[PDB]
A paper describes a structure:
In this work, we report the discovery of multiple VHHs that bind distinct cross-reactive epitopes on the spike protein.
To further analyze this rare antigenic site, we used X-ray crystallography to determine the structure of [name] bound to the [name]-2 RBD. The structure reveals that the third complementarity-determining region (CDR3) of [name] forms a platform through which the [name] binds to a concave cleft on the RBD, inserting Leu107 into a small cleft formed by Tyr396 and Phe464. The structure helps to rationalize how [name] is still able to bind and neutralize the Omicron variant, as the epitope does not overlap with any of the 15 RBD mutations in this VOC. Notably, the [name] epitope is fully occluded in the closed state and partially occluded in the open state of the spike protein. Modeling [name] binding onto the full [name]-2 spike protein indicates that the [name] would introduce a clash with the NTD from the neighboring spike protomer in either the closed- or open state. Consistent with the AUC-SV experiments, we observed dissociation of the spike trimer upon binding to [name], but not 1E4, with calculated masses of the complexes being comparable to AUC-SV experiments. Together, these data clearly indicate that the binding of [name] to its cryptic epitope results in the complete dissociation of the [name]-[name]-2 spike trimer, whereas the spike trimer remains intact upon 1E4 binding.
Numbering used by the authors:
A (entry chain A): 333 to 527
B (entry chain B): 1 to 131, 135
Amino acid sequence: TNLCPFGEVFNATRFASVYAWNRKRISNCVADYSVLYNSASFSTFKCYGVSPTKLNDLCFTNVYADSFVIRGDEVRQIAPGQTGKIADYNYKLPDDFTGCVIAWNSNNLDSKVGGNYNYLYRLFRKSNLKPFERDISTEIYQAGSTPCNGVEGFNCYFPLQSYGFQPTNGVGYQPYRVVVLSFELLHAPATVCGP
Amino acid sequence: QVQLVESGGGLVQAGGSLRLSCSASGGTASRSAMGWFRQAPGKEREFVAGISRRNSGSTYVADSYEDSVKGRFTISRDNAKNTIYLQMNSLKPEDTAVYYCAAEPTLGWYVPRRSVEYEYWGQGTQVTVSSA
Ligand SMILES: *[C@@H]1O[C@H](CO[C@@H]2O[C@@H](C)[C@@H](O)[C@@H](O)[C@@H]2O)[C@@H](O[C@@H]2O[C@H](CO)[C@@H](O)[C@H](O)[C@H]2NC(C)=O)[C@H](O)[C@H]1NC(C)=O
């Protein structure tokens, strides 16, 4: 009977940095996705393996809500088969992804005069993330042939870079809050259905 | 005896098109019906399309289709290459699945339809359909 806590996710005060993205698993609840697809606030609402209109008719074992902040140019990387700093080093979707990617401009919330430097992204990594893998380490990245000894220097970089969100940034460089919904269907009793 | 290798999967927008190929290694393939199955997440393997074996002295070809893909999907078999194709038009989000190629030795123009009625299977190719 109880409704799914989608409000806790979409309307959370603070969102996670993309390198340390947040995940909430949702189960044993009634999901009304109509609040989502009807609203005009989202600038991205692309689904994979499901039609957005029929979401209230489907039943799943679990629904996963991953949320973080990236800049506008990088929302596109939140899709299966994508490549780039975000898709390779921060948040990676699987090829068999079933779910929806939802994003909206958050410049009024996540930028500040002088810059918001709380939102970080990983810029280097020795190898690509696996699907839904998370890397929160902070070791100096060795971009050259010479060891870094744990300190920054020539070809030796701090792995996390700040976004520096200023309200006057071009819309491509403005903060976007992203919620990725993953619909898990198993040979098991469904626990998240529509009304 | 029969090795099946699919290819041609990928991501595509609702309404778009896709063409899957499956090549069969082995002489047993020529006397085998061949077909396509698909498996969505959390579901059993289900029939998509099938095509009859090569029969000497005739050009007649029997096929069979799952009703929900009639007209949108077409199965075809290459002459003397033992490769089958699945032309996939007007794709819907609900077409998302792993698509498997299958082969089954049989007699005459029979096209089997259950997954337990095909012996040989490929590894699968992923098809994902998006919708704005
Ligand atoms: C996220 O919140 C919006 C807006 O929340 C409103 O303001 C808050 C401070 C609080 O007072 C909420 O209770 C308010 O509703 C939600 O959008 C509202 O949704 C309701 C129900 O669909 C609708 O009647 C209102 O008109 C909507 N308001 C606006 C401005 O669109 C939204 O539903 C919340 N998201 C989720 C996933 O729950």
